[PDB]
């Protein structure tokens, strides 16, 4: 009765996730592994393979290249932000919250969920790009100049640990609903109807991992730790911004690399 209602909440969340996010983890993994119909992604692993890429213009200046990448990738994230907002309205009790608190919770949670979406696109060797038609290597990203080599390596590091948990789309829905309903965000008017939906969401999650991963070991706690890791990736972005502002120049970067980085986050 209590546990039946937990399972039903889990189900409702998963159908509503399926409906809000066309790019599921299962579809990204099919692309990556090779279950795919359509031709495999093109691999970019060096400058020669970069330039043999015409599957995707004007003249950015050294001390703006990075900022313009960051702006570029955030503006390209709007579709993702709208899908997460769509999903969020489906979480029971959400739209019942004070409109101001709905916006607040999305404004913070959206960054963390985006990194969860990125981990789907990653494996230990690299990341899908250009709507899943290309694949950029981890080693090549890391090789690049100046401050750019350290943009993505810490995101890879997280994704590899997060992807080792082997969550599927039905676990991810609940996990994502939990992130959104975080009682601690800055400026929340009423931090308690929020904490109460979350607690209910934690129970369903706890049950979901028992049913779905009956072999596993502290999966629930390991997954709750990742919420902390997600916040740190977001806050680490502020430090990175400082590093750009006073680097030993130059920060030119081939256009096509700029284009590639705007598909990341």
């Amino acid at each position: 009765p209590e546990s039946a209602d937990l399972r039903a909440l889990a189900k409702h969340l998963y159908d509503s996730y399926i409906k809000s996010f066309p790019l599921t983890k299962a579809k990204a993994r099919a692309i990556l592994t090779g279950k795919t119909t359509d031709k495999s992604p093109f691999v970019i692993y060096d400058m020669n393979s970069l330039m043999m890429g015409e599957d995707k213009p004007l003249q950015e200046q050294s001390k703006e290249v990075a900022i313009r990448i960051f702006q570029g990738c955030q503006f390209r994230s709007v579709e993702a932000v709208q899908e997460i907002t769509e999903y969020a309205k489906s979480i029971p009790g959400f739209v019942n919250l004070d409109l101001n608190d709905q916006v607040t919770l999305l404004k913070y949670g959206v960054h963390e969920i985006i990194y969860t979406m990125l981990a789907s696109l990653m494996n230990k060797d690299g990341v899908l790009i250009s709507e899943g038609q290309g694949f950029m290597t981890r080693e090549f990203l890391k090789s690049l100049r100046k401050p750019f080599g350290d943009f993505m390596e810490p995101k890879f590091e997280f994704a590899v640990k997060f992807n080792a948990l082997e969550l599927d789309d039905s676990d991810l829905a609940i996990f994502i609903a939990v992130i959104i309903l975080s009682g601690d965000r800055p400026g929340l008017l009423n931090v308690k109807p929020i904490e109460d939906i979350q607690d209910n969401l934690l129970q369903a999650l706890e049950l979901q991992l028992k049913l779905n991963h009956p072999e596993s070991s502290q999966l629930f706690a390991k997954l709750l730790q990742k919420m902390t890791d997600l916040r740190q990736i977001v806050t680490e972005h502020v430090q990175l911004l400082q590093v750009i502002k006073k680097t030993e120049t130059d920060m030119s970067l081939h256009p096509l690399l700029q284009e590639i980085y705007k598909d990341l986050y």
């Binding site: 709007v78 932000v81 907002t85 769509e86 409109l99 709905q102 916006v103 404004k107 959206v110």
Partner: peptide
């Protein structure tokens, strides 16, 4: 100029 909140607010409505 309209930021992240605005796109969130427009999608909620």
């Amino acid at each position: 100029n309209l930021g992240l909140e605005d796109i969130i607010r427009k999608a909620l409505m």
